[PDB]
UniProtKB/TrEMBL annotation, chain A:
GO cellular component: periplasmic space
Protein's name according to its UniProt entry: beta-lactamase
Binding residues for Zn(2+) 3: 126
Domain Metallo-beta-lactamase: 27-197
Amino acid sequence: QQLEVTKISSKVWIHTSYKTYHGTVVPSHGLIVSTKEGAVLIDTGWGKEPTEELLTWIKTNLKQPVKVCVPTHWHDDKLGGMEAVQRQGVPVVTSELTAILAAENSKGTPDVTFATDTTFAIGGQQLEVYFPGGGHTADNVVVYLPQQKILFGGCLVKDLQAKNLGNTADADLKSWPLAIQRLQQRYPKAKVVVPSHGPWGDQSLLSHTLSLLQNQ
Amino acid sequence: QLEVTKISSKVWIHTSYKTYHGTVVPSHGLIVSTKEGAVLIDTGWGKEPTEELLTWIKTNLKQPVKVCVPTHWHDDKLGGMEAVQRQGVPVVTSELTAILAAENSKGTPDVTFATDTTFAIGGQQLEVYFPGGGHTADNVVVYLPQQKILFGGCLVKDLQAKNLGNTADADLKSWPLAIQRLQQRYPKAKVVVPSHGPWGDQSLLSHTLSLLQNQ
Ligand code: NA
Ligand code: NA
Ligand SMILES: [Zn+2]
Ligand SMILES: [Zn+2]
Ligand SMILES: [Zn+2]
Ligand SMILES: [Zn+2]
Ligand SMILES: [Zn+2]
Ligand SMILES: [Zn+2]
Ligand SMILES: [Zn+2]
Ligand SMILES: [Zn+2]
Ligand SMILES: [Zn+2]
Ligand SMILES: [Zn+2]
Ligand SMILES: [Zn+2]
Ligand SMILES: [Zn+2]
Ligand SMILES: [Zn+2]
Ligand SMILES: [Zn+2]
Ligand SMILES: [Zn+2]
Ligand SMILES: [Zn+2]
């Protein structure tokens, strides 16, 4: 039903892509971060058409170029707009294994890969990318803004109104619980936790995901 | 067309909708669940949204509403008082909100308070505080000190608000001072919930100030 963007901090937005699946509409959340030197994209739209809207939005309202885009794993909902991003000269950057799994599933090829947990800064804004272990996918990573204390958990974290874990096909049900606990131990002062497919909240989203993982 | 979303393990935001001046406007309140019942911050935006709200609480929280607390006298935060009261729920407000309610054909609250109050129900602590006139002369906020969640109602604007919105009953000269009182009473608030837009961090307070140096 399109693409929606909402502001949560003075320099942080959440972009939301929609797709109707069977019964009901499913959102997909990413982040936009504005810096003094360009915008950072955490996740593409849920495919090409949401991603073209997202780019058009960034150009109209932030009136700055996207310096980089960082998918959080290989699935279409977090990376299916990569081709759209790369066609505008924006570098897409992923973990090494996200690049591997994309190649094995005929997704595009990132422009750069990283094999290490990385902290970097653009335009006064610092970002951390971190691998807590397999959960939703073997390669899912999170992104932390330590200044705004905002943790983006992608499909690794579920929202407080999710009643189960959804699809478990590529899922790593055995590792997911320890990945959550890694997040709880590494970001003890996170203020906002952003899931992919529901509303965001406080650090209750980690304990709720842990709870879903002890009741299956 | 009521909607309820959870933001913390014991905190929901209830949202009614209306079109106002060609745009869709949400109105958010809180539901707080406690070991001894539910606390309601704001009613629905009128009778039908509030009975939806009441039914929601009974179906999913399956506990009675112990008290309801409107944050000022306008319909979006108080227009469902009768429906709450027909179910025996106590409505309690500041003394000045009761005066303005009587002055504008809203109902009569069951209890009024003239003091900033900290109280607890079922393990849950709540703070009600009057920072001064802003959106209306009587607006108060609600703070959950354990979750560090501040409900600012219509005193705070969301980060995509381009102006102050409804200013009819507003007190534009005091409003800046109330925002600064909030900034200094809740320096470590994690979430700030406005009435008529998405919630965020304490950026929402500095943003509301900005709308107030540039009107
Ligand atoms: Na990997
Ligand atoms: Na939310
Ligand atoms: Zn830059
Ligand atoms: Zn720029
Ligand atoms: Zn996925
Ligand atoms: Zn292309
Ligand atoms: Zn990079
Ligand atoms: Zn990386
Ligand atoms: Zn940061
Ligand atoms: Zn997903
Ligand atoms: Zn989710
Ligand atoms: Zn497995
Ligand atoms: Zn009002
Ligand atoms: Zn009114
Ligand atoms: Zn009071
Ligand atoms: Zn007034
Ligand atoms: Zn209002
Ligand atoms: Zn939030």
